[PDB]
Amino acid sequence: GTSKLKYVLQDARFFLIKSNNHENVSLAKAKGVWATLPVNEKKLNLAFRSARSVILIFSVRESGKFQGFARLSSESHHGGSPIHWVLPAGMSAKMLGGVFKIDWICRRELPFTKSAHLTNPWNEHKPVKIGRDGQEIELECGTQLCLLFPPDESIDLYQVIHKM
Ligand SMILES: CNc1ncnc2c1ncn2[C@@H]1O[C@H](CO)[C@@H](O)[C@H]1O
């Protein structure tokens, strides 16, 4: 049922993540880590320190779908086990240096055709599928976006709730 997910999403802030490739999402789904460019890294840190939950909703460029969503469990962290990211054209390993730890909540896909009725007030009320990497999604729009995803049987919400 939705009681457990709604408990996670309450008072959450939501950010769209746009990956240039599928490989780094595969990597991120397995290890439970993410990294973004310095502008979004600051914004996710600021949001982490201040919101009860910070939810990342992932979408691979040109895929036409979201691939899942995850909640930050830590702020940016530099100087650990180097992540073998597939680096898009024009990017340092150090640009993706602040590694966020994330707990995935859903790793299943949601096509854009199923989100078409949802628009984001914080992005001029365009459909929520429209946005750049890091675009923040108003509370209700992002809550509804996350409730559209199918239940993931590989995921147990228990560890997320125990650390919230
Ligand atoms: C591991 N982290 C990442 N992996 C793949 N693409 C990313 C990414 N972080 C940002 N991007 C995207 O790649 C573009 C190149 O800067 C950005 O505008 C984002 O849309």
PDB file of N, CA, C and O and ligand atoms in Angstrom, residues 17-22 24-25 27-28 33-37 40 58-59 61 83 85-91 95-96 132-134, ligand 1:
ATOM      1  N   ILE A  17      16.765  14.479 -12.330  1.00  0.00           N
ATOM      2  CA  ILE A  17      18.131  14.162 -12.720  1.00  0.00           C
ATOM      3  C   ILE A  17      18.100  13.670 -14.157  1.00  0.00           C
ATOM      4  O   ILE A  17      17.366  12.724 -14.481  1.00  0.00           O
ATOM      5  N   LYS A  18      18.905  14.300 -15.008  1.00  0.00           N
ATOM      6  CA  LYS A  18      18.978  13.955 -16.420  1.00  0.00           C
ATOM      7  C   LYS A  18      20.373  13.425 -16.708  1.00  0.00           C
ATOM      8  O   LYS A  18      21.363  14.158 -16.591  1.00  0.00           O
ATOM      9  N   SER A  19      20.443  12.140 -17.030  1.00  0.00           N
ATOM     10  CA  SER A  19      21.675  11.455 -17.360  1.00  0.00           C
ATOM     11  C   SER A  19      21.848  11.445 -18.873  1.00  0.00           C
ATOM     12  O   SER A  19      20.889  11.219 -19.618  1.00  0.00           O
ATOM     13  N   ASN A  20      23.069  11.709 -19.327  1.00  0.00           N
ATOM     14  CA  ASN A  20      23.357  11.626 -20.751  1.00  0.00           C
ATOM     15  C   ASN A  20      23.492  10.186 -21.250  1.00  0.00           C
ATOM     16  O   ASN A  20      23.617   9.988 -22.464  1.00  0.00           O
ATOM     17  N   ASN A  21      23.488   9.181 -20.364  1.00  0.00           N
ATOM     18  CA  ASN A  21      23.704   7.805 -20.809  1.00  0.00           C
ATOM     19  C   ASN A  21      23.063   6.814 -19.845  1.00  0.00           C
ATOM     20  O   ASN A  21      22.812   7.121 -18.679  1.00  0.00           O
ATOM     21  N   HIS A  22      22.836   5.597 -20.348  1.00  0.00           N
ATOM     22  CA  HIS A  22      22.227   4.544 -19.540  1.00  0.00           C
ATOM     23  C   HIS A  22      23.217   3.917 -18.565  1.00  0.00           C
ATOM     24  O   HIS A  22      22.827   3.508 -17.465  1.00  0.00           O
ATOM     25  N   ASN A  24      25.664   5.025 -16.553  1.00  0.00           N
ATOM     26  CA  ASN A  24      25.781   5.585 -15.208  1.00  0.00           C
ATOM     27  C   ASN A  24      24.523   5.393 -14.362  1.00  0.00           C
ATOM     28  O   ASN A  24      24.603   5.411 -13.127  1.00  0.00           O
ATOM     29  N   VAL A  25      23.365   5.199 -14.983  1.00  0.00           N
ATOM     30  CA  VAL A  25      22.185   4.851 -14.204  1.00  0.00           C
ATOM     31  C   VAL A  25      22.252   3.384 -13.767  1.00  0.00           C
ATOM     32  O   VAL A  25      21.911   3.049 -12.628  1.00  0.00           O
ATOM     33  N   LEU A  27      24.994   1.786 -13.164  1.00  0.00           N
ATOM     34  CA  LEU A  27      25.964   1.832 -12.076  1.00  0.00           C
ATOM     35  C   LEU A  27      25.317   2.365 -10.804  1.00  0.00           C
ATOM     36  O   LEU A  27      25.449   1.774  -9.725  1.00  0.00           O
ATOM     37  N   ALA A  28      24.585   3.471 -10.926  1.00  0.00           N
ATOM     38  CA  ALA A  28      23.965   4.108  -9.768  1.00  0.00           C
ATOM     39  C   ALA A  28      22.904   3.213  -9.132  1.00  0.00           C
ATOM     40  O   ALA A  28      22.722   3.227  -7.908  1.00  0.00           O
ATOM     41  N   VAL A  33      24.844   5.181  -5.492  1.00  0.00           N
ATOM     42  CA  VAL A  33      25.589   6.438  -5.472  1.00  0.00           C
ATOM     43  C   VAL A  33      25.169   7.275  -6.667  1.00  0.00           C
ATOM     44  O   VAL A  33      24.748   6.756  -7.703  1.00  0.00           O
ATOM     45  N   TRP A  34      25.331   8.587  -6.523  1.00  0.00           N
ATOM     46  CA  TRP A  34      25.181   9.483  -7.658  1.00  0.00           C
ATOM     47  C   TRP A  34      26.147  10.661  -7.522  1.00  0.00           C
ATOM     48  O   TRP A  34      26.664  10.947  -6.434  1.00  0.00           O
ATOM     49  N   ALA A  35      26.368  11.354  -8.647  1.00  0.00           N
ATOM     50  CA  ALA A  35      27.184  12.563  -8.700  1.00  0.00           C
ATOM     51  C   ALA A  35      26.706  13.460  -9.841  1.00  0.00           C
ATOM     52  O   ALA A  35      26.297  12.986 -10.907  1.00  0.00           O
ATOM     53  N   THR A  36      26.755  14.765  -9.604  1.00  0.00           N
ATOM     54  CA  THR A  36      26.286  15.757 -10.563  1.00  0.00           C
ATOM     55  C   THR A  36      27.303  16.897 -10.623  1.00  0.00           C
ATOM     56  O   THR A  36      28.297  16.905  -9.889  1.00  0.00           O
ATOM     57  N   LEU A  37      27.057  17.869 -11.502  1.00  0.00           N
ATOM     58  CA  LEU A  37      27.995  18.969 -11.681  1.00  0.00           C
ATOM     59  C   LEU A  37      27.908  19.925 -10.493  1.00  0.00           C
ATOM     60  O   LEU A  37      26.946  19.879  -9.725  1.00  0.00           O
ATOM     61  N   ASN A  40      24.404  21.736  -9.300  1.00  0.00           N
ATOM     62  CA  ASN A  40      23.394  20.892  -8.678  1.00  0.00           C
ATOM     63  C   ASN A  40      23.903  20.255  -7.395  1.00  0.00           C
ATOM     64  O   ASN A  40      23.108  19.967  -6.498  1.00  0.00           O
ATOM     65  N   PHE A  58      15.144  10.137 -11.800  1.00  0.00           N
ATOM     66  CA  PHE A  58      16.116   9.991 -12.888  1.00  0.00           C
ATOM     67  C   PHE A  58      15.431   9.856 -14.240  1.00  0.00           C
ATOM     68  O   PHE A  58      14.408   9.179 -14.357  1.00  0.00           O
ATOM     69  N   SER A  59      16.034  10.455 -15.270  1.00  0.00           N
ATOM     70  CA  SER A  59      15.568  10.292 -16.646  1.00  0.00           C
ATOM     71  C   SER A  59      16.774  10.325 -17.574  1.00  0.00           C
ATOM     72  O   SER A  59      17.558  11.275 -17.528  1.00  0.00           O
ATOM     73  N   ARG A  61      18.481  10.958 -21.029  1.00  0.00           N
ATOM     74  CA  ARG A  61      18.229  11.730 -22.247  1.00  0.00           C
ATOM     75  C   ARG A  61      17.789  10.826 -23.388  1.00  0.00           C
ATOM     76  O   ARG A  61      18.368   9.760 -23.614  1.00  0.00           O
ATOM     77  N   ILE A  83      34.606   6.338  -8.564  1.00  0.00           N
ATOM     78  CA  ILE A  83      33.529   5.712  -9.325  1.00  0.00           C
ATOM     79  C   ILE A  83      33.874   5.736 -10.812  1.00  0.00           C
ATOM     80  O   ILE A  83      34.209   6.783 -11.372  1.00  0.00           O
ATOM     81  N   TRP A  85      32.609   6.218 -13.590  1.00  0.00           N
ATOM     82  CA  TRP A  85      31.533   6.773 -14.409  1.00  0.00           C
ATOM     83  C   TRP A  85      31.906   6.725 -15.889  1.00  0.00           C
ATOM     84  O   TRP A  85      33.079   6.803 -16.256  1.00  0.00           O
ATOM     85  N   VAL A  86      30.896   6.575 -16.742  1.00  0.00           N
ATOM     86  CA  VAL A  86      31.052   6.872 -18.163  1.00  0.00           C
ATOM     87  C   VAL A  86      30.925   8.385 -18.297  1.00  0.00           C
ATOM     88  O   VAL A  86      29.836   8.937 -18.127  1.00  0.00           O
ATOM     89  N   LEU A  87      32.034   9.060 -18.581  1.00  0.00           N
ATOM     90  CA  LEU A  87      32.052  10.523 -18.540  1.00  0.00           C
ATOM     91  C   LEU A  87      31.510  11.099 -19.839  1.00  0.00           C
ATOM     92  O   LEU A  87      32.046  10.798 -20.913  1.00  0.00           O
ATOM     93  N   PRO A  88      30.446  11.897 -19.804  1.00  0.00           N
ATOM     94  CA  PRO A  88      29.982  12.559 -21.023  1.00  0.00           C
ATOM     95  C   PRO A  88      31.051  13.473 -21.603  1.00  0.00           C
ATOM     96  O   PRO A  88      32.020  13.850 -20.940  1.00  0.00           O
ATOM     97  N   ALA A  89      30.868  13.820 -22.873  1.00  0.00           N
ATOM     98  CA  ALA A  89      31.868  14.619 -23.567  1.00  0.00           C
ATOM     99  C   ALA A  89      31.957  15.996 -22.923  1.00  0.00           C
ATOM    100  O   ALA A  89      30.994  16.768 -22.944  1.00  0.00           O
ATOM    101  N   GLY A  90      33.099  16.291 -22.327  1.00  0.00           N
ATOM    102  CA  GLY A  90      33.345  17.564 -21.701  1.00  0.00           C
ATOM    103  C   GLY A  90      33.393  17.548 -20.186  1.00  0.00           C
ATOM    104  O   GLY A  90      33.125  18.587 -19.568  1.00  0.00           O
ATOM    105  N   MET A  91      33.720  16.420 -19.565  1.00  0.00           N
ATOM    106  CA  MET A  91      33.557  16.318 -18.123  1.00  0.00           C
ATOM    107  C   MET A  91      34.755  15.642 -17.478  1.00  0.00           C
ATOM    108  O   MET A  91      35.266  14.640 -17.984  1.00  0.00           O
ATOM    109  N   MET A  95      34.800  16.889 -11.710  1.00  0.00           N
ATOM    110  CA  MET A  95      33.474  17.509 -11.766  1.00  0.00           C
ATOM    111  C   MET A  95      32.424  16.635 -11.080  1.00  0.00           C
ATOM    112  O   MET A  95      31.572  17.142 -10.337  1.00  0.00           O
ATOM    113  N   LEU A  96      32.465  15.324 -11.320  1.00  0.00           N
ATOM    114  CA  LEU A  96      31.590  14.364 -10.638  1.00  0.00           C
ATOM    115  C   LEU A  96      32.211  13.846  -9.356  1.00  0.00           C
ATOM    116  O   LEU A  96      32.158  12.645  -9.081  1.00  0.00           O
ATOM    117  N   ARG A 132      15.686  20.597 -17.129  1.00  0.00           N
ATOM    118  CA  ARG A 132      17.106  20.316 -17.214  1.00  0.00           C
ATOM    119  C   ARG A 132      17.542  19.529 -15.978  1.00  0.00           C
ATOM    120  O   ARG A 132      16.811  19.430 -14.992  1.00  0.00           O
ATOM    121  N   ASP A 133      18.737  18.944 -16.051  1.00  0.00           N
ATOM    122  CA  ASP A 133      19.343  18.275 -14.901  1.00  0.00           C
ATOM    123  C   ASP A 133      19.323  19.185 -13.679  1.00  0.00           C
ATOM    124  O   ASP A 133      19.859  20.294 -13.711  1.00  0.00           O
ATOM    125  N   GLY A 134      18.689  18.720 -12.603  1.00  0.00           N
ATOM    126  CA  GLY A 134      18.602  19.482 -11.374  1.00  0.00           C
ATOM    127  C   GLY A 134      17.325  20.274 -11.183  1.00  0.00           C
ATOM    128  O   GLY A 134      17.168  20.910 -10.139  1.00  0.00           O
TER     129      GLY A 134
HETATM  130  C1  LIG B   1      27.119  10.384 -13.068  1.00  0.00           C
HETATM  131  N1  LIG B   1      26.509  11.681 -13.317  1.00  0.00           N
HETATM  132  C2  LIG B   1      25.991  11.987 -14.636  1.00  0.00           C
HETATM  133  N2  LIG B   1      25.973  10.971 -15.491  1.00  0.00           N
HETATM  134  C3  LIG B   1      25.515  11.166 -16.749  1.00  0.00           C
HETATM  135  N3  LIG B   1      25.075  12.395 -17.125  1.00  0.00           N
HETATM  136  C4  LIG B   1      25.096  13.433 -16.258  1.00  0.00           C
HETATM  137  C5  LIG B   1      25.545  13.242 -15.015  1.00  0.00           C
HETATM  138  N4  LIG B   1      25.461  14.418 -14.366  1.00  0.00           N
HETATM  139  C6  LIG B   1      24.952  15.328 -15.202  1.00  0.00           C
HETATM  140  N5  LIG B   1      24.724  14.725 -16.375  1.00  0.00           N
HETATM  141  C7  LIG B   1      24.152  15.328 -17.598  1.00  0.00           C
HETATM  142  O1  LIG B   1      25.196  15.564 -18.505  1.00  0.00           O
HETATM  143  C8  LIG B   1      25.139  16.921 -18.986  1.00  0.00           C
HETATM  144  C9  LIG B   1      26.540  17.375 -19.301  1.00  0.00           C
HETATM  145  O2  LIG B   1      26.970  18.379 -18.397  1.00  0.00           O
HETATM  146  C10 LIG B   1      24.429  17.678 -17.877  1.00  0.00           C
HETATM  147  O3  LIG B   1      23.803  18.863 -18.332  1.00  0.00           O
HETATM  148  C11 LIG B   1      23.434  16.659 -17.334  1.00  0.00           C
HETATM  149  O4  LIG B   1      22.228  16.696 -18.087  1.00  0.00           O
END
